A paper describes a structure:
To validate our design by high-resolution structural analysis using X-ray crystallography, we created an ADDobody prototype with minimized loops, called ADDobody-Xtal, based on the assumption that long flexible loops could be detrimental to crystal lattice formation. During X-ray diffraction data collection and structure determination, two different crystal forms were observed: In the absence of zinc ions, ADDobody crystals adopted space group P1 and diffracted to a resolution of 3.17 Å. In the zinc-free ADDobody crystal form, the VL loop could be manually traced through the density in some of the monomers. In the zinc-free ADDobody crystal form, twenty ADDobody monomers are found in the asymmetric unit. Of note, five ADDobody monomers formed a penton in the crystal reminiscent of the ring-like arrangement in pentons formed by the PBP in the ADDomer. Two such penton rings in the zinc-free triclinic crystal form a barrel-like decamer where the VL and RGD loops are outward facing and accessible. The Coulomb potential indicates a complementary patch of negative and positive charges at the ADDobody surface which contribute to penton ring formation in the crystals. Specifically, D106 forms a charge-charge interaction with R83. The stacking of the two penton rings is mostly mediated by van der Waals interactions, with residue F153 playing a central role. A cation-V interaction is formed between F153 and R140 of an adjacent chain, and F16 could also interact with F153 of the neighboring ADDobody polypeptide chain.
Numbering used by the authors: 7 to 181, 195 to 245, 283 to 301
Write the structure that this text describes.
């Protein structure tokens, strides 16, 4: 027959923009008195190749994430990029289930971890480009307009899809102290976004279903049917997505 992922069908490539370097401006000479909020963040595009084969649908998302992380291992971390800065992460869960209207946090302190639909999560300055890729159809994310040249979903395009912050359940129980979770185990930042309600990560599935129907990503996208892969088991954003079993 023919494998589900091969170069003839163009289902092994996809372009994505990720953070490349994090360096203080000029000669700051980063010391104790450095804010680290003035770091210069440079982003860049790359074409990510996956091996060929069948690769299911969840295993496809596992390999797509692995391609992003391989780039971070090659150029990313060596130029000051943190694990808190990995922008492109492909997930399958609803990041808004634990949300509470009064606190506007997710009280369970953990995202639901139940597979619903393939998703794209991004950090500011990042994005994915499926213009020359057929992996979008495999993720169940297609253009709402068939004749729309290009299919580039980026961070600026996902208005209203910010992943809510996790409740600091430990502080809450130590009482009430309804506090957002700033970091995780191993002290890598969740990016709490100052408003103390949401994170800097933006989910496509959130902007589609919980965002503005017009002037959002739903306006021109369509939701259709679809420990090396869990390098960050403690991070609730970067954890291996659940499988629809």
């Amino acid at each position: 027959i023919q494998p589900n992922v091969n170069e003839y069908m163009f289902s092994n490539k996809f372009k994505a923009r990720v953070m490349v370097s994090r360096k203080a401006p000029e000669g700051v000479t980063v010391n104790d008195t450095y804010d680290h909020k003035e770091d210069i963040l440079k982003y860049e595009w790359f074409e990510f190749i996956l091996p060929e084969g069948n690769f299911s649908a969840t295993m496809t998302i596992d390999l797509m994430n692995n391609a992003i992380i391989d780039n971070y291992l090659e150029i990313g971390r060596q130029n000051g990029v943190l694990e808190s800065d990995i922008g492109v992460k492909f997930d399958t869960r609803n990041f808004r289930l634990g949300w509470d209207p009064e606190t506007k946090l997710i009280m369970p302190g953990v995202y639901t971890y139940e597979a619903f639909h393939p998703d794209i999560v991004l950090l500011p300055g990042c994005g994915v480009d499926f213009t020359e890729s057929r992996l979008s159809n495999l993720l169940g994310i297609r253009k709402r307009h068939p004749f729309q040249e290009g299919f580039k979903i980026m961070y600026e395009d996902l208005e209203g899809g910010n992943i809510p912050a996790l409740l600091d359940v430990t502080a809450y129980e130590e009482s009430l102290k309804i506090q957002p979770l700033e970091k995780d185990s191993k002290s890598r930042s969740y990016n709490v976004l100052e408003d103390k309600i949401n994170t800097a990560y933006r989910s496509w599935y959130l902007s589609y279903n919980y965002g503005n129907p017009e002037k959002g990503i739903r306006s021109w996208t369509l939701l259709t049917t679809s420990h090396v892969f869990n390098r960050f088991p403690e991070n609730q954003i970067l954890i291996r997505p659940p499988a629809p079993t």
